[PDB]
Every structure is written in structure tokens, then in C-alpha cells.
Scaffold this active site. Structure first.
Site, PDB file in Angstrom:
ATOM      1  N   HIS A   1       0.783  -3.573   5.137  1.00 36.27           N
ATOM      2  CA  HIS A   1       1.121  -2.015   5.636  1.00 36.27           C
ATOM      3  C   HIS A   1       0.058  -0.980   5.228  1.00 36.27           C
ATOM      4  O   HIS A   1      -0.023  -0.029   5.750  1.00 36.27           O
ATOM      5  CB  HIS A   1       2.224  -1.580   5.782  1.00 36.27           C
ATOM      6  CG  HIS A   1       2.835  -1.231   4.456  1.00 36.27           C
ATOM      7  ND1 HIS A   1       3.772  -1.842   3.308  1.00 36.27           N
ATOM      8  CD2 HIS A   1       2.771  -0.043   3.765  1.00 36.27           C
ATOM      9  CE1 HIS A   1       4.034  -1.022   2.454  1.00 36.27           C
ATOM     10  NE2 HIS A   1       3.427   0.085   2.711  1.00 36.27           N
TER      11      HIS A   1
ATOM     12  N   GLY B   1       3.117   5.716  -1.857  1.00 38.64           N
ATOM     13  CA  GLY B   1       2.205   5.548  -2.770  1.00 38.64           C
ATOM     14  C   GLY B   1       2.350   4.576  -3.641  1.00 38.64           C
ATOM     15  O   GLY B   1       1.371   3.973  -4.219  1.00 38.64           O
TER      16      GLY B   1
ATOM     17  N   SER C   1       3.297   1.537  -2.876  1.00 41.76           N
ATOM     18  CA  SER C   1       3.384   0.657  -1.712  1.00 41.76           C
ATOM     19  C   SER C   1       2.134  -0.349  -2.236  1.00 41.76           C
ATOM     20  O   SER C   1       0.935   0.191  -2.586  1.00 41.76           O
ATOM     21  CB  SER C   1       3.096   0.943  -0.327  1.00 41.76           C
ATOM     22  OG  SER C   1       3.950   1.849   0.075  1.00 41.76           O
ATOM     23  N   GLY C   2       2.264  -1.662  -2.035  1.00 45.29           N
ATOM     24  CA  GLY C   2       1.232  -2.532  -2.459  1.00 45.29           C
ATOM     25  C   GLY C   2       1.072  -2.958  -3.847  1.00 45.29           C
ATOM     26  O   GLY C   2       0.547  -3.736  -4.171  1.00 45.29           O
TER      27      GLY C   2
ATOM     28  N   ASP D   1       4.805  -8.951   4.535  1.00 42.80           N
ATOM     29  CA  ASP D   1       3.964  -7.963   3.880  1.00 42.80           C
ATOM     30  C   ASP D   1       3.137  -7.963   3.035  1.00 42.80           C
ATOM     31  O   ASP D   1       3.230  -7.826   1.683  1.00 42.80           O
ATOM     32  CB  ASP D   1       4.924  -6.702   4.047  1.00 42.80           C
ATOM     33  CG  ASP D   1       4.156  -5.311   3.846  1.00 42.80           C
ATOM     34  OD1 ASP D   1       2.817  -5.190   3.835  1.00 42.80           O
ATOM     35  OD2 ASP D   1       4.623  -4.291   3.317  1.00 42.80           O
TER      36      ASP D   1
HETATM   37  C1  LIG Z   1       4.690   2.858  -0.134  1.00 43.12           C
HETATM   38  O1  LIG Z   1       4.281   3.366  -1.363  1.00 43.12           O
HETATM   39  C2  LIG Z   1       5.845   3.335   0.553  1.00 43.12           C
HETATM   40  C3  LIG Z   1       7.189   2.272   0.396  1.00 43.12           C
HETATM   41  C4  LIG Z   1       7.704   2.542  -1.039  1.00 43.12           C
HETATM   42  C5  LIG Z   1       8.898   2.794  -1.237  1.00 43.12           C
HETATM   43  C6  LIG Z   1       5.491   3.042   2.285  1.00 43.12           C
HETATM   44  C7  LIG Z   1       6.715   3.393   3.227  1.00 43.12           C
HETATM   45  C8  LIG Z   1       5.546   3.848   4.621  1.00 43.12           C
HETATM   46  C9  LIG Z   1       4.613   4.531   3.897  1.00 43.12           C
HETATM   47  C10 LIG Z   1       4.139   3.799   2.665  1.00 43.12           C
HETATM   48  O2  LIG Z   1       3.039   3.021   2.915  1.00 43.12           O
END
Ligand SMILES: *C(=O)[C@H](CC=C)[C@H]1CCC[C@@H]1O
Length: 241
Positions: free
Chosen positions: A45, A186, A188-189, A93
Site C-alpha cells: 500500500h 508513517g 506502514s511498511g 499487503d
Molecule cells: C502506515 O503508517 C499506516 C498504518 C499504520 C498504523 C497506513 C494507513 C493508511 C495510510 C498509511 O499508509
């Protein structure tokens, strides 16, 4: 990370910053893990085929060019073929990014180790999430790498309807869920790091999603892609690209 603390400098040497080009500024958008000298692991994502990407490695402060830190251009993007962006709760994901050239390994830049195929962590296992995401929901992002301690919540508990119910699959990991500590936008990943039975740190999860009620939320554990489900896919992509 909400409710965490500053990591020790360079203590998570596999952690990457994934950045994109924003109007001639390089902008943090996701985390990642160095998983081979040419490949970073991250969340699907985080990828848009329209953006241009670089990865920053061997870093602690996002704003300081520290000696021994490195930016590398990303040259190939490989998203899991079963990933659907319109169905985030199905999982898959996961993405692998190829670097323009291989990095040399150092004391600040190392490979992150993966669990065996099929490895499941039991309830209340201790792990740590790391990243440069928000320090609270809709709040500030730090400059310094944070970490936060998160205990695994097993499938049986996490799928309960007071927790995530049927949003959560066996291709994910739940961790946290007390409302004190969580991942946040932030992060994420980036890695869920858990130390195996013999001392070694392994990357078991990729930060994927939290709740729309808030990053840190009681009985909404942060959800992670379960890496031990894709060991075979990770190695195929590397052999084949
Ligand atoms: C990533 O940091 C986020 C999940 C973390 C708890 C995502 C949610 C949607 C935007 C972001 O990429």
C-alpha cells in the site's frame, strides 16, 4: 509510533526510510526492511506506480545526513500479485523493492533476518515496532527513529468481535491492543521485530493497518502482514528479478 521511545542510534540496522519525490523535496512516506543487498521489503500500500522512490539506509535522524547513511534509488517495484488496494483486510499487503545498486554491508546497514516459513508467534510474545511515523493519531512525526513494545495478540483473540472480528485473517499478525502503544501513519511498511528463541532478531511482520478509531486503541491491535507466510514469494522475486 504512539507511546514509544527513541531507539538507540543504529540499533535497528535493517530499518529503512522509504521516500518519494515530492515537488523536488524528498519526503518520507513509509518504512521498510533491508532484506538482501539489493532488496527492500515493505507494504504494497505504500507503492504508487506513478511516484518516484528512494530508500534511505543507516539512518537515525531523518533530517541529518549522518556519516555512513545512504540514499539509493529504487529501480524495480514488485507488489504481491494477490494484493488488492480496495480490499486491505484481505491481506497480502507486501512488496519488494529493488535498489539501483547493491548496498555494502556495514555496522549501520545490515540485513534483516526472516523467520522460518510457517512460523507463528504465540499470544503475548514480546516484539518491538519501529519507525518514523506519527507520535500520536493525527499528531507529530519525530525526527529520530522510535521504537515501541508490542505484545502479540494471537488469531483466536484478535478475531473476536470485540477485537477485529472478521477483518483479520491468518495471513496477518496482531500486536498491541492495549491503547497505549501502537504503530501509526508513517510506520506502514516497516518491521515488527521479534527476538527468536536463540537471541536473534527477526522481522516477523510488516506494518499494514490500524483502526479508524485511532492508531492507539484498546482492543484494536495494530495489524501486520505475516512475513512467514511469504518466504517463498520473497525468494522467488529475488531469484527472478
Ligand atoms: C502506515 O503508517 C499506516 C498504518 C499504520 C498504523 C497506513 C494507513 C493508511 C495510510 C498509511 O499508509
Amino acid at each position: 509510533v504512539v507511546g514509544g521511545e527513541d531507539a538507540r542510534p543504529n540499533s535497528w540496522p535493517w530499518q529503512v526510510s522509504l521516500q518519494y519525490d515530492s515537488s523536488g523535496q524528498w519526503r518520507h512516506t513509509c518504512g521498510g526492511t533491508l532484506v538482501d543487498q539489493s532488496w527492500v521489503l515493505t507494504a504494497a500500500h505504500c507503492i504508487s506506480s506513478s511516484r518516484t522512490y528512494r530508500v534511505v539506509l543507516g539512518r537515525h535522524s531523518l533530517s541529518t545526513n549522518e556519516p555512513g547513511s545512504l540514499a539509493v534509488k529504487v529501480s524495480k517495484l514488485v507488489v504481491h500479485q494477490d494484493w488488492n488496494s480496495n480490499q486491505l483486510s484481505n491481506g497480502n499487503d507486501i512488496a519488494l523493492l529493488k535498489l539501483a545498486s547493491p548496498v555494502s554491508l556495514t555496522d549501520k546497514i545490515q540485513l534483516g533476518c526472516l523467520p522460518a516459513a510457517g512460523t507463528i508467534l504465540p499470544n503475548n510474545y514480546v516484539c518491538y515496532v519501529t519507525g518514523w511515523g506519527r507520535l500520536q493519531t493525527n499528531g507529530a512525526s519525530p525526527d529520530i527513529l522510535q521504537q515501541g513494545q508490542l505484545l502479540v495478540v494471537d488469531y483466536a483473540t484478535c478475531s473476536k468481535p470485540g477485537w477485529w472480528g472478521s477483518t483479520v485473517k491468518t495471513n496477518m499478525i496482531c500486536a498491541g491492543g492495549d491503547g497505549i502503544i501502537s504503530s501509526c501513519n508513517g510506520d506502514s511498511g516497516g518491521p515488527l521485530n521479534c527476538q527468536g528463541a536463540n537471541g536473534q532478531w527477526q522481522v516477523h511482520g510488516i506494518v499494514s493497518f490500524g483502526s479508524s478509531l485511532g492508531c492507539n486503541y484498546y482492543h484494536k491491535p495494530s495489524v501486520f502482514t505475516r512475513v512467514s507466510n511469504y518466504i517463498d514469494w520473497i525468494n522467488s522475486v529475488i531469484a527472478n528479478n
